[PDB]
């Protein structure tokens, strides 16, 4: 089908990437730098760490957000249904939460085998919550050399948009209900093979095994979480 | 093992993905005997793009076949410096440490082919009561064996001593040819070494005379 | 160009702690790796990402990296830790291997334990006599055994056997057997083995008198 | 020619009596072809046991020796048995290596 | 019928010096007893590990051997160590004999 579970796609990814730019993002696939060796804290200082000056007073907000890098858990990702295949560089991982791969498909749904080279190739991914089908949201790397993200709408002298978690800042808002991207909590990621290439500033995160229940089904998953500076168990 | 002729090409092979998720990156490392490790390049099955080292930018070509699930590097124009053991490593996708170093493959080449260098040896210019001076000529840096040495068109063979060739450290050969002759025949006869090396069509003559002294 | 430097060789005694240094410019900002290579064997990972060790490596290995130096530390060094060690780093989209460092452990001298077993009566009944000398638990290899029959030296008519080195203790064993005809054996009185070897102030002689008991 | 081994004891020293651990063994001689397998009591002893490589005799025959170190005080009540197995001859031979009487 | 060896030493060429390599050679002529030994001592200081030896076989109607010893010197090494010497030890000789020369080609 359009999606593929079990951590095995075949080749039908979009092999369209760029080489003019000298940034060498593709060349940065063999190795990753240290936390402080790549100037992360400049790019990590633009979002509020723990408690975002809010209390509260269930609804969904469309709004918008299209500009800033999705490198920390604050975001308002938009809804994406179809994307041209000329822009995609690498697998497009979508989160059930369990990672799943979507491959290039023709307009009418016919699978195509061209490594994404042919012009007409597109990707159909109608972001939708698993309770109604499909995946919460998902991520890939654009051809020009920058990460992208997309997903469902955030739910409900300061402001707070919650794309995930916000347990204490909402009447028990959970991932199964409001989760959009791979951010299970403010400091946890849904680990997948290419995680270190789309989020290279989470290299220092430690590994973890987790169990989750969404709707009426159960998912066994491996997550990545750093040393949270308050507590391990809640 | 079987020695590859200079200027030819060799292939080093490795297992590769058959057209599915790999979750590893392949790399090639060459080790000359007791000289340490040197990198050549890396390859990612998922993204066919390779990555070559600078030093070997012009001679290496990495390509993979998915039907055979096998990826190989072709190295062309081998020289005497390229005799070494090749290791093929498979490391995690984005951590940059190579694990499971596979069995090494040894490749040997045999230097080059060139003619000899001829030099004389000054006979003792000091008067000797016995009356015997040992002239000599030295032939070194030639490959391959053998060479033929004669004295004065082959008409002088009483006392000639042609020592067997010795292997040099570099990889070439050295040899000497010595004749002992009466002392009172050093300024009245002409002594010439004639060195012939067919493998490179080298015919060289060299006169040997005591050096000028006042 | 980026180049990493290591000391050429390091020598330590068993049970001590050895440190190997891989140095560079601002190396502390890199993720260094360590490979161990035995003579004629493919190198194996021993440390990745400074202090993270894989499964199957004993707890003796340890590592650290700071400033301009990465240190590989070994505790309780033993004879199975002599090998070449290489330091790996990444720079400017290029791999860099540091100059290999050869770690060798200095072995100690062990005095041989020497015994002499005379011939058996049952063998003597068959007309052939054998007198055997055993030197066990000694090091280095070069030890010399000389037989004496009533102050007469023995040349030939003797067999020498040596076993393989022991990994844990680094010691050898040596059997020296002398064969004689019955009449010749009973034509002499005093028998002696003589050992000369490092670790002994003077050569040691183990002798007996046949026909006594 | 399938000639079986001949086994002879290597008895311990007359006294050598101290904390000076003694040694005892068995000598296999005049067999062909190689190899034999040497086992101590029930083949359940591995501490301080040595079996040297087979040496070529003068007349194209072979010889080999097995030796084990043993604490002296154990010789009083314990016993040791050498077992030699030779496959070409399909022969297993057992001997008792007792300390010498040393009396006259 | 032990026969003492005859020793010769030849300076390097006037040509190799332009190639950045020096090669001193020392020759032992006819001598029956096979055992022998040469020892290069330059400026009353001995070297080893940078010299090679070659040996022939006795002629048909004879029994004596011949030996040559070549010592290789890297570039600029021959520029110093004024004195050079080849020493030989053997039977027949009353004492080991040394043949020496000055680098000045006197
Ligand atoms: C890009 O597109 C697809 C993405 O879906 C890529 O991957 C697909 O993956 C398939 C599975 O590996 C590939 O086809 C396979 O080819 C294998 C080759 O193995 C040999 O086949 C030949 C047949 O003459 C013989 O030497 C042996 O039988 C070997 O098995 C096949 O093994 C494999 O399954 C086979 O099917 C037939 C039975 O009907 C037999 O070959 C055998 O019994 C075995 O069961 C399958 O055929 C291939 O890469 C691709 N799938 C197809 C259908 O092409 C491709 O890599 C890229 N290109 C294309 C065109 O897909
Ligand atoms: C996917 O690949 C595409 C192309 O293949 C890359 O996409 C983006 O290209 C635009 C170039 O226009 C640039 O981002 C935006 O450019 C805007 C102007 O076009 C900028 O907005 C406003 O522009 C004003 C006039 O220039 C100026 O006052 C000010 O700059 C203001 O912001 C804005 O800078 C946007 O960044 C980038 O090159 C790129 N977008 C990025 C990097 O965010 C890109 O490689 C991939 N798409 C991404 C990363 O979103
Ligand atoms: C999945 O992708 C998009 C999501 O809305 C839908 O495609 C739309 O098609 C209309 C038809 O003209 C375009 O005008 C819109 O721009 C498209 N929407 C986009 C790009 O967001 C598609 O129908 C969706 N699948 C459904 C609804 O089943
Ligand atoms: C990617 O970069 C290339 C140069 O490497 C340049 O042509 C263009 O920006 C991109 N590719 C193509 C085919 O246009
Ligand atoms: C990373 O660690 C420290 C502490 O956060 C940081 O200040 C620096 O930028 C980096 N390295 C060092 C050695 O300080
Ligand atoms: C590419 O897509 C276009 C439009 O569908 C059409 O030419 C054909 O389907 C494809 N051709 C090739 C060569 O892939």
Please give the structural blueprint:
The complex is a heteropentamer, with one copy of chain A (234 residues), two copies of chain B and two copies of chain C.
Chain A: E1 3-4, H1 40-44, E2 82-84, E3 92-95, E4 99-102, E5 122-124, E6 137-142, E7 146-151, H2 175-178, E8 183-185, E9 188-190, H3 195-198, E10 206-214, E11 217-225
Antiparallel strand pairs in A: 1-4, 2-5, 3-4, 3-6, 6-7, 8-9, 9-11, 10-11
Chain B: E1 9-15, E2 25-31, E3 37-43, E4 50-52, E5 60-65, E6 70-76, E7 84-91, E8 105-107, E9 117-121, E10 132-142, E11 148-151, E12 161-162, E13 166-167, E14 173-182, E15 192-197, E16 202-207
Antiparallel strand pairs in B: 1-6, 2-3, 2-7, 3-4, 5-6, 7-8, 9-10, 10-14, 11-15, 12-14, 13-14, 15-16
Chain C: E1 9-12, E2 18-23, E3 33-37, E4 44-48, E5 62-66, E6 69-74, E7 83-91, E8 94-97, E9 101-105, E10 113-117, H1 121-125, E11 128-138, E12 143-149, E13 152-153, E14 158-162, E15 172-181, H2 182-185, E16 190-197, E17 204-209
Parallel strand pairs in C: 1-9
Antiparallel strand pairs in C: 2-6, 3-4, 3-7, 5-6, 7-8, 7-9, 10-11, 11-15, 12-13, 12-16, 14-15, 16-17
The structure holds a molecule of 5 linked components (NAG-NAG-BMA-BMA-BMA), a molecule of 4 linked components (NAG-NAG-BMA-BMA), a molecule of 2 linked components (NAG-NAG) and 2-acetamido-2-deoxy-beta-D-glucopyranose (3 copies).
GO molecular function (chain A): RNA binding
Main location (chain A): host cell
Disulfide bonds (chain A): 17-89, 40-201, 47-72, 80-150, 94-138, 155-178, 162-166, 188-225
Q: Could you tell me the strand content of chain B as a percent range? A: 35-45%
CATH class call of the largest domain in chain C: Mainly Beta
List ligands, each type once.
a molecule of 5 linked components (NAG-NAG-BMA-BMA-BMA), a molecule of 4 linked components (NAG-NAG-BMA-BMA), a molecule of 2 linked components (NAG-NAG), 2-acetamido-2-deoxy-beta-D-glucopyranose
Task: Report the count of strand segments of chain C.
Answer: 17
Name given to the CATH homologous superfamily of the largest domain in chain C? Immunoglobulins
Count of strand segments of chain B: 16
CATH class bucket of the largest domain in chain B: Mainly Beta
Distance between the termini of chain B: 58 Å
Largest sheet of chain B: 5 strands, antiparallel
As a percent range, the share of strand residues of chain C is over 45%
Number of domains of chain C: 2
- Output the radius of gyration of chain B: 28 Å
Disulfide bonds (chain A): 17-89, 40-201, 47-72, 80-150, 94-138, 155-178, 162-166, 188-225
Domain Hepatitis C virus Non-structural protein E2/NS1 (chain A): 1-226
Glycosylation sites (chain A): 18, 36, 118, 126
Protein name (chain A): Genome polyprotein
